């Protein structure tokens, strides 16, 4: 009814420990969600065009041309790690657990409140807010996944990460098909590169509406909505990283001479000439057996063209890579391709008291060593006459195409049947948790944006809207915009995310890396004197595991 609550606030994470080292981690997340009535009650097909920016030669990477259907609905998205765990919970998970499973998801809307705003004609602004007890909130659960999948974490538009801070839903929109051509150029190109937007292909048109595709529930102040429990079928997520490169696979060479005194200058020596050694190599025309030429079971990681942009029907897009750059751990400035960069606002980890539109940014460096150091790569002749001469070796400094800033590694691909790689680690708090699998016939082996992928399906998107609150002067025949009473809603969203995790075991004599609070990061986890909070990112795959 009007004066009866329809739900309870719960934001507790429970760790129920099972037998055999397994734990059920049920994270509860409760938020107060504020929603305004849509700017327009219609669906719009809006073409965003920034040909001015890309008309500058060399700016083709800044292309934003696209077409989107803007809908009157808003999306309630909780597909981010920060929506579910605080730094203490994440510390417990990443320190005491070795693998993580995604078990189930539930969400519900309760304690719906709808208020109308009456603004007076007095010259200084003044307004009052009245409860509209008969107003309704339109809630649609796309449990069949009919609507396009538009996760908000990629735009930093999920629910807020603070239980005590009210959050908002994101206005929903989806991509409409378009055709676009953009010939790349550079500073110094003469003429106007081909840069046109060709329109839309009629055979690819797909105009979706929530009304025609999903059942819609009208919730009054005394109503509540529950989606029901959804159960995932994803793969386990490892909370351990691998450190072994191809150089550290298998049996090391026997050292016939060992150091007689400790110290950094004292080295063990194999004691056998490199061309007189025993072993197996894939180089059938050389007698040298070294750490770089000896046979290994397979290849850890792969090389791909980095900062390569491929053009397709809808324009250019960067070629993704599964693994981050090698050497970003020895030198943090080397983080670039494959090291995801997260930019977020005050709702999602940035200092809440900051002013301005500049977001808080961080580049994530994974502990796994599956990356590549292209500056140390090279190609050489099949003859393999050592030491190699100039014409028989292609080095990373050799120009490709006549460009001194482009080398073969930029266009180099080593993906093959022997490539072995890991899934992307969870990124806390701004990383996505689960992502829908592509509906293609042949599917990618992994996604670079979420550690869990939906093989069959994952829970339907939740859409909310303020039902039209018409005045007495509504005329559907009029071409002017619908006249509505200014209405807004505040409702409580509660979600339950259930994981299954395995407790880690100590395999080595030495201790391992753990996340800990210290003097440097001590104040990143507590509020300031005025209430300013923040959530800094945390690494997940802290403990190491042996690859081979």
């Amino acid at each position, epitope marked *: 009814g009007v004066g009866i609550s329809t739900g309870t606030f719960n934001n507790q994470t429970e760790f129920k420990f099972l037998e055999n080292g397994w734990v059920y981690i049920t994270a509860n997340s409760s938020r107060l969600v504020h929603l305004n009535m849509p700017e327009s009650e219609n669906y719009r097909r809006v073409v965003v065009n920034n040909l001015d920016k890309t008309a500058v030669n060399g700016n083709m990477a800044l292309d934003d041309t696209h077409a989107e259907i803007v809908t009157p609905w808003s999306l309630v998205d909780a597909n981010a790690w920060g929506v579910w765990f605080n730094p203490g919970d994440w510390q417990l998970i990443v320190n005491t657990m070795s693998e993580l499973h995604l078990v189930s998801f539930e969400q519900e809307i309760f304690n719906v409140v709808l208020k109308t705003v009456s603004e007076s004609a007095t010259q200084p602004p003044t307004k009052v807010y009245n409860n509209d007890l008969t107003a309704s909130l339109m809630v649609a659960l796309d449990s069949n996944n009919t609507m396009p999948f538009t996760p908000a974490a990629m735009r930093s538009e999920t629910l807020g990460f603070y239980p005590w801070k009210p959050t908002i839903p994101t206005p929903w929109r989806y991509y409409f098909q378009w055709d676009r051509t953009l010939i790349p150029s550079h500073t110094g190109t003469s003429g106007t590169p081909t840069n046109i937007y060709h329109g839309t292909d009629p055979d690819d048109v797909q105009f979706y509406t929530i009304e025609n595709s999903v059942p819609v529930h009208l919730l009054r102040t005394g109503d509540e909505f529950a989606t029901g429990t959804f159960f995932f079928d994803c793969k386990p997520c490892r909370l351990t990283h691998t450190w072994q490169t191809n150089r550290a696979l298998g049996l090391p060479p026997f050292l016939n001479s060992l150091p007689q005194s400790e110290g950094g200058t004292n080295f063990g020596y194999i004691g056998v000439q490199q061309d007189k050694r025993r072993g197996v190599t894939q180089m059938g025309n050389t007698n040298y057996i070294t750490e770089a030429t000896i046979m290994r079971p397979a290849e850890v990681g792969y090389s791909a063209p980095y900062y390569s942009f491929e053009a397709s029907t809808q324009g250019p897009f960067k070629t993704p890579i599964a693994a981050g750059r090698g050497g970003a751990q020895t030198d943090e*400035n080397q983080a*670039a391709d494959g090291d995801p960069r997260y930019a977020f606002g005050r709702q999602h980890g940035q200092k809440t008291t900051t002013t301005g539109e500049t977001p808080e940014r961080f580049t994530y460096i994974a502990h796994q060593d599956t990356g590549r150091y292209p500056e140390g790569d090279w190609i050489q002749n099949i003859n393999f006459n050592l030491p190699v001469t100039d014409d028989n070796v292609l*080095l990373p400094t*050799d120009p490709i195409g006549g*460009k001194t800033g482009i080398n073969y590694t930029n266009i180099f691909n080593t993906y093959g049947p022997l490539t072995a790689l890991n899934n992307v680690p969870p990124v806390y708090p701004n990383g996505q948790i689960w992502d829908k699998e592509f509906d293609t016939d042949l599917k990618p082996r992994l996604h670079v944006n979420a550690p869990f992928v939906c093989q069959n399906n994952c829970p339907g998107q939740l859409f909310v809207k303020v039902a039209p609150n018409l005045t007495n002067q509504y005329d559907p025949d009029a071409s002017a915009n619908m006249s509505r009473i200014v209405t807004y809603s505040d409702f409580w969203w509660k979600g339950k995310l259930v994981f299954k995790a395995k407790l880690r075991a100590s395999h080595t004599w030495n201790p391992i890396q753990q996340m800990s609070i210290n003097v440097d990061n001590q104040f990143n986890y507590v509020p300031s004197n005025i209430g300013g909070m923040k959530i800094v990112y945390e690494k997940s795959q802290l403990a190491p595991r042996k690859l081979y």
Partner: antibody
């Protein structure tokens, strides 16, 4: 945009010490390898010191090894060159140098400061 | 010790083409040396003309071109202007993290 300003150059007797300070602006200081070059009065440019990497690894020319120390403070966006046991041969204009390639270094001085003169004389 | 040799002095008429060369007494210069060319005027700090043997910083006129000729680095000025008269210094990346500088070439526009 990218600006480097050197200071601390002054007349000093042989065998003394002096710290040149280089203030950088218009760019992320910690993301670029920095260095100190020097030009003797009427002579050509000579590389003095280089600081590179997120670990602040340092390399020095043979003429200043053991005597010069190159360091950086990214909080202040400052580059420090501390010279000890200064000689008359160290008298010159010292230029701040910034490499423009953060993830792929140019291995060359992209930006230069106005320079600070250091005179070593008894 | 590494020694970089370049022409002590060079001359070019206005609107002409001149080439300054930078070699090594022992060895050859390649793109692995990342040859850099810097311009210095009287009483002013050096200005970067070329980096990575081909790249001129934004604002550098197109009349300056960097290349690798033979076993040396070459800086070619085509249509040389009066303001191009200055001392041009060549920097070679000598591996590891060591840099070497040439003696310098005094280019005067007649």
């Amino acid at each position: 945009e990218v600006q480097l300003v050197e200071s601390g150059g002054d007349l000093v007797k042989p065998g003394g010490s002096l710290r040149l300070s280089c203030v950088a602006s218009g760019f992320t200081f910690s993301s670029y390898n920095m260095g100190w070059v020097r030009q003797a009065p009427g002579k050509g440019l000579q590389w003095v010191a280089w600081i590179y990497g997120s670990r602040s690894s340092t390399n020095y020319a043979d003429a200043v090894k053991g005597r010069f120390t190159i360091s950086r403070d990214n909080a202040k966006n400052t580059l420090y060159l501390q010279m000890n046991s200064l000689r008359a041969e160290d008298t010159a204009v010292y230029y701040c140098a910034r490499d423009g390639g953060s993830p792929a270094a140019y291995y060359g001085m992209d930006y230069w400061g106005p320079g600070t003169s250091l005179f070593v004389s008894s | 010790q590494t020694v970089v040799t370049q022409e002590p002095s060079l001359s070019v008429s206005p609107g002409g083409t001149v080439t300054l060369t930078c070699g090594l007494s022992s060895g050859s210069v390649s793109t692995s040396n990342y040859p850099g060319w810097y311009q210095q005027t009287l009483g002013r700090a050096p200005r970067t003309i070329i980096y990575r043997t081909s790249s001129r910083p934004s604002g550098v006129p197109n009349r300056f071109s960097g290349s690798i000729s033979g076993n040396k680095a070459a800086l070619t000025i085509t249509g040389a202007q009066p303001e191009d008269e200055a001392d041009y210094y060549c920097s070679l990346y000598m591996g590891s993290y060591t840099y070497v500088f040439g003696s310098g070439t005094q280019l005067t526009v007649l």
